Amino acid sequence: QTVSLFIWLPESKQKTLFISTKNHTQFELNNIIFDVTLSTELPDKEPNAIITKRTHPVGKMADEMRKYEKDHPKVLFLESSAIHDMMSSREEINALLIKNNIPIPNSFSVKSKEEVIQLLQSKQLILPFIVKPENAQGTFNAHQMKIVLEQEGIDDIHFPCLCQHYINHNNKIVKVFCIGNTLKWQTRTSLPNVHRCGIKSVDFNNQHLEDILSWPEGVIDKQDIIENSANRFGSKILEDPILLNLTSEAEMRDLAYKVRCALGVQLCGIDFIKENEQGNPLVVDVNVFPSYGGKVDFDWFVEKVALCYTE
Ligand SMILES: Nc1ncnc2c1ncn2[C@@H]1O[C@H](COP(=O)(O)OP(=O)(O)CP(=O)(O)O)[C@@H](O)[C@H]1O
Ligand SMILES: O=P(O)(O)O[C@H]1[C@H](O)[C@@H](O)[C@H](OP(=O)(O)O)[C@@H](OP(=O)(O)O)[C@H]1O
Ligand SMILES: [Mg+2]
Ligand SMILES: [Mg+2]
């Protein structure tokens, strides 16, 4: 039997994702011959599956994608417009995690300051909390965060947004990348533990963590400033999370399976933290068709996609 897989990615994503690339590649896996094509444009001939990350929620690619899906219903998308749309909403992601009993820090999708005030006044939302845009993917603004340390810190929040209780997690985050059942994981630095010293809020873009160098004195412990200032608070690789006693392989596989089932996604990245590095994983982010840690082997990627396709 033969299966055609078509990888549809712009050069920008091809460059960040792959060490190198190939046009024609054919291989056999589990008694099936896979023909894999990579292009920046949609296929002229209908394949069995299209493997794609939609660069932006709106625009030409998004439009082409929706049209193609409608007009070629037999083509499997990894991942579809519908999955990208859901994964572009922090509300929709967290609703599915909650519905599927996957621990997260306490989270509220809010539309207004009045709503935030009521959540604070009723002791539902506990300080400090991080404010994440409702839009989750495809822009610089999607990653523009505020940490609210005191009630007065709510004044300049951009709505709609997710307000999520801030967990002091000792500046370690576990990243689990999935190609279906195939996993890759790592630990990175994250954000420092924060202190409620009187400062009302601080801001950072997750793509520009050097913002943290400018936070007022007292929010971060002096020793944490010493330990992280040399790399400008950048997202730095740490030791393997099992070796660090943060998690186990079985825990990561269980969590990743639960998230994939909850969200109906095969190609994703899951970020989780633990309060004081102990207890339940707390999922803080799920991303469609992620970085996989950057610069991955092309042949590895396509074989694992083929494996996923069979399953
Ligand atoms: N509830 C929480 N408590 C403490 N820190 C949190 C947190 N939620 C997120 N963080 C920190 O903020 C960072 C950015 O949050 P998040 O991962 O949700 O945004 P994002 O979707 O912009 C990241 P990506 O670039 O991986 O998509 C995380 O990497 C983590 O360091
Ligand atoms: O895999 P991690 O380390 O979690 O980071 C990814 C983010 O999670 C994605 O949201 C990025 O996509 P966008 O820049 O389109 O939002 C994505 O950008 P990319 O698709 O260009 O690689 C990555 O930065
Ligand atoms: Mg993240
Ligand atoms: Mg994200």
Side-chain angles (χ1 to χ4, degrees):
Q1 303 297 336
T2 306
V3 171
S4 52
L5 309 173
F6 190 92
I7 309 176
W8 178 35
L9 295 173
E11 274 183 34
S12 64
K13 178 67 175 183
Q14 291 187 36
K15 282 161 189 161
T16 57
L17 179 62
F18 298 126
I19 304 164
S20 59
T21 58
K22 294 196 285 186
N23 190 331
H24 158 261
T25 186
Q26 177 184 111
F27 57 90
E28 191 181 316
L29 178 62
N30 299 351
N31 204 43
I32 300 167
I33 304 155
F34 290 92
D35 269 44
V36 185
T37 305
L38 167 75
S39 174
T40 55
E41 307 293 349
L42 274 168
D44 193 50
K45 305 167 194 65
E46 191 178 324
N48 297 294
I50 290 169
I51 313 311
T52 193
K53 178 173 208 334
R54 185 181 69 187
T55 317
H56 303 291
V58 288
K60 180 175 175 283
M61 190 178 186
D63 291 343
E64 291 177 323
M65 206 151 153
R66 285 176 172 86
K67 176 74 168 176
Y68 191 95
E69 289 185 60
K70 186 69 179 188
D71 285 359
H72 315 259
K74 293 174 185 172
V75 178
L76 174 66
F77 272 69
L78 298 174
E79 299 289 344
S80 71
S81 293
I83 291 296
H84 285 261
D85 285 347
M86 178 273 275
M87 300 285 280
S88 77
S89 164
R90 294 198 168 90
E91 178 168 23
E92 289 179 37
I93 292 164
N94 286 291
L96 287 167
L97 296 178
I98 293 166
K99 183 169 171 62
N100 288 279
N101 307 301
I102 295 161
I104 61 170
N106 197 24
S107 298
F108 305 88
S109 287
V110 165
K111 293 180 159 191
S112 73
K113 193 182 286 173
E114 291 305 334
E115 191 174 357
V116 175
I117 291 161
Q118 193 72 33
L119 292 173
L120 287 167
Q121 182 248 353
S122 66
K123 305 179 185 288
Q124 293 186 64
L125 180 59
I126 306 304
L127 291 156
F129 62 91
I130 188 163
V131 179
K132 312 185 188 183
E134 158 60 8
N135 297 324
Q137 192 259 307
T139 55
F140 176 83
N141 289 358
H143 308 284
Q144 184 64 46
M145 314 302 191
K146 184 188 297 299
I147 301 164
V148 173
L149 298 159
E150 302 299 341
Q151 192 185 346
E152 296 79 10
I154 68 175
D155 283 20
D156 298 336
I157 288 170
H158 290 197
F159 298 94
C161 58
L162 185 84
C163 289
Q164 180 174 86
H165 179 64
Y166 190 92
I167 300 293
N168 280 351
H169 56 282
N170 304 341
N171 197 22
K172 294 190 178 78
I173 192 159
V174 181
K175 302 188 74 78
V176 180
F177 305 107
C178 307
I179 302 157
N181 296 128
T182 300
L183 305 195
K184 177 176 167 60
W185 56 76
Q186 57 182 217
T187 318
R188 303 196 80 82
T189 58
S190 184
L191 290 178
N193 296 333
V194 301
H195 291 79
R196 293 174 64 191
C197 68
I199 298 296
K200 310 309 173 198
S201 63
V202 291
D203 299 282
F204 75 98
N205 192 290
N206 202 51
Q207 296 181 351
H208 207 252
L209 291 167
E210 54 263 60
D211 292 346
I212 299 166
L213 295 173
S214 292
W215 288 4
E217 184 180 334
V219 178
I220 304 166
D221 179 79
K222 292 286 201 78
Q223 190 58 40
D224 294 347
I225 293 165
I226 292 170
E227 60 182 17
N228 302 108
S229 286
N231 71 15
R232 300 168 167 169
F233 284 92
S235 179
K236 170 185 158 49
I237 192 73
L238 297 175
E239 287 165 290
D240 170 277
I242 308 168
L243 293 179
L244 288 176
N245 304 127
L246 280 170
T247 190
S248 63
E249 182 165 359
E251 176 164 85
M252 289 184 287
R253 290 194 192 281
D254 172 70
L255 178 60
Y257 179 79
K258 286 166 164 171
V259 170
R260 290 193 312 274
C261 287
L263 295 180
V265 66
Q266 305 292 336
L267 308 182
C268 65
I270 301 161
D271 295 341
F272 75 82
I273 63 179
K274 290 186 175 192
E275 187 159 54
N276 196 25
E277 292 174 71
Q278 290 187 358
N280 289 354
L282 304 170
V283 172
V284 296
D285 193 23
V286 192
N287 304 307
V288 70
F289 202 149
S291 70
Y292 294 92
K295 191 173 168 279
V296 310
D297 186 282
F298 185 80
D299 289 332
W300 171 80
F301 178 81
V302 302
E303 185 178 295
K304 297 309 180 182
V305 169
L307 183 62
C308 177
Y309 180 89
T310 70
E311 292 164 2

